[PDB]
Structures are given as structure tokens and as C-alpha cells.
């Protein structure tokens, strides 16, 4: 199971009216491979198997909480863990029906 509860969901933010494109690619690199959505600020970096562009912002901004556009896995860097937590069910629900 993922964290039920971790101490940095009070950093995310309240989700863009455009909504979420789970289709977006990397901010950094353009990939379209293993992208994430930053909870936070909503910018759109790739995972550590492609060029680790979101572990990068995590670094440079400290936003702790991304999502994943390829399974809807919401994973913390600082506790270095999944969470799970009904402040991200709206989030969660948006990408899952843009993606499916
Ligand atoms: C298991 N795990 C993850 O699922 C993620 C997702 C976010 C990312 O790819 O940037 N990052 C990790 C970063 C270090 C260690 C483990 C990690
Ligand atoms: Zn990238
Ligand atoms: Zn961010
Ligand atoms: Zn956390």
C-alpha cells in the first residue's frame, strides 16, 4: 500500500482550471516517455528512467509531491514513498479521465 497520510500534502496546490494533459511532454528534455505532473505547480518533467527532469525540479524548487501520467501514483521525494490521501482524489480522478 502507499502512505495513507504524509507530511507535504499540505503543499498541494489547487489544480489548474485547464486542467491536466497527461499526454504533455517533458518540460526539460520533450520526451513523451514516463512523464510526471508536479503537485505543486503543475509543470510536466520525465522520470528518473528517461532523463530525471522531475527529480531535477524537485531538486531546484523543493516541491515534494509528483504524479505519475502513466499509472496515477502519487510519489513523495522527501519521504521517499507513494501516498495516498483523499486531498489527491480530485487530482487523481481529472488525469485518469484525461488519460483512459
Ligand atoms: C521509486 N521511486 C519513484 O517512483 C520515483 C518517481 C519520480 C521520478 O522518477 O522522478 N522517484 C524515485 C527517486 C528515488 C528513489 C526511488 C524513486
Ligand atoms: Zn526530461
Ligand atoms: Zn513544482
Ligand atoms: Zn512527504
Known amino acids: 500500500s502507499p502512505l495513507p497520510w504524509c507530511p507535504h500534502l499540505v503543499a ?4 489548474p482550471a485547464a486542467g491536466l494533459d497527461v499526454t504533455q511532454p517533458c518540460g526539460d528534455c520533450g520526451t513523451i516517455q514516463e512523464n510526471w505532473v508536479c503537485l505543486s505547480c503543475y509543470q510536466v518533467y520525465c522520470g528518473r528512467y ?3 527532469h522531475m527529480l531535477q525540479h ?3 524548487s523543493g516541491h ?3 504524479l505519475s ?3 496515477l501514483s502519487a510519489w513523495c521525494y522527501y519521504c521517499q514513498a507513494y501516498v495516498h490521501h483523499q486531498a489527491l482524489l480530485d487530482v487523481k480522478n481529472i488525469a485518469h479521465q484525461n488519460k483512459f
Open 12 to 15: 498541494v496546490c489547487p489544480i
Open 50 to 52: 528517461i532523463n530525471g
Open 58 to 60: 524537485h531538486g531546484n
Open 64 to 66: 515534494p509531491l509528483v
Open 69 to 71: 501520467y502513466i499509472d
